[PDB]
Symmetry: C3
Amino acid sequence: INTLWTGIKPPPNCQIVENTDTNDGKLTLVLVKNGGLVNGYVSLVGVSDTVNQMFTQKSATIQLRLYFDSSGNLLTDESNLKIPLKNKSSSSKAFMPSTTAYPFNTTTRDSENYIHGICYYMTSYDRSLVPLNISIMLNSRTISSNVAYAIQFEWNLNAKESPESNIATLTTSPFFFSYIRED
Amino acid sequence: INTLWTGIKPPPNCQIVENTDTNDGKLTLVLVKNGGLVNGYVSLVGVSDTVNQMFTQKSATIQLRLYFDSSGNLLTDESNLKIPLKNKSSSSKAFMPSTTAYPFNTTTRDSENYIHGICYYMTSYDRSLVPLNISIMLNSRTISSNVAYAIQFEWNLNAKESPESNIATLTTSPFFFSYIRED
Amino acid sequence: INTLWTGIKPPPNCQIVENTDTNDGKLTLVLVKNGGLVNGYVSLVGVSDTVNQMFTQKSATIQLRLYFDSSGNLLTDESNLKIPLKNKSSTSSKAFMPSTTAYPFNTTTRDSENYIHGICYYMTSYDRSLVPLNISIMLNSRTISSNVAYAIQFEWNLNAKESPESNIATLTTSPFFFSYIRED
Ligand code: NA
Ligand code: NA
């Protein structure tokens, strides 16, 4: 009982664009209990035409907010992820980011709640690697009384010229991370 | 049984140069089962004069292709790694990259099969850090029907000027990665 | 018992400025036994005014050297970390140490293989711009006492075209993740 995840190769399970009716992204997320940490793995594939045209511009931003109740279960209504996580062979509380290490803030000082790094996009044409700034915010903000934990992923494209000129499957190469886990 | 590796500080065990008669590199590779993922660690040391003069130019590329049969055992003839992996204390299928998450491709779009990142080379003179693009291709391609799994490492040097002007031990700083594992 | 760490959100527990009287930094370090490796997590928060003005310049360097005896216990006098590590569950920490075979103590200057290299980030107080910090971890390689059996050295380097801050601000380094081959 070490793994909390989206399952492998999930059907569209999340909503990237502001007001969309349909899930427009496939989020792959794996969380593994490893002593006092969680080991993490995250990658994203775009589904809708709107998502898959975002890299038609030189800048772009994708944000997925996940909120969990006190039992560590996904709050579907509030979250961008619309399908609950599950165990690999089956109180997901033990997978959650620690509220001590990453507390909810009553001010804008929040630097210690962030993980920062880089993953990559492969262009469709010549297969160039385009850097994407990835930041993960742990807890920090809350939007309702039902929220006990939170994980926010944000990818940023910031290039001198657009990676694509036409529609193409948006993919983000896997990003690896750890954080101090709850209880 | 939770570790599959080359052993610590192995002898020359891999073949970087095409037609070489002798193993010309020491590959250190550690794969650890961690819930639904494998945690990986990989670094390379050059042995032959040819390898240790590659960084005498401003661009260079090193590619190690590992192929495994259906039991997760190294296919020595086909691979660049010439010495089979082993456990830390002594049954390798469970260490392999998942064929569901990283399938073999008959299309051309193998974007989702790649891990990308950066490690570093320390120059012999002032010990300045030179960036190396590292990409790991999981599965995707199979040269032979014996092959059930594959892991490919590729280091790229792409500098404005050559890191060295003479022979010097090629070393790549350890690169860390995870991937979704089989069964 | 798989975790050796500083505890969560520790008090000032290390010394960035060599010759200071008081602990001037909070080091968060987590080491987890994972088969043949240790999985690592490290981040730093500055405490003193001196530390929190370092990023007032365009270049800066922070070095923390940890030394351990043959039992894997912190040598407090020799180290920059002044508070001993402990297990998560509240007599060997040897199994958490960097392998002396994979990362040996040397007698010359050809020790590339003892180094881990990577990047973490500083968030500026002004517009929250991300400033890159070169992080390098040296395993073993060096002794400075008959009692040193293992060593871990963390070094952060700021090297920018202009200074991240113009005034005092809390120095923080975003978490850096690493693995190494562990002892026994
Ligand atoms: Na719920
Ligand atoms: Na709360």
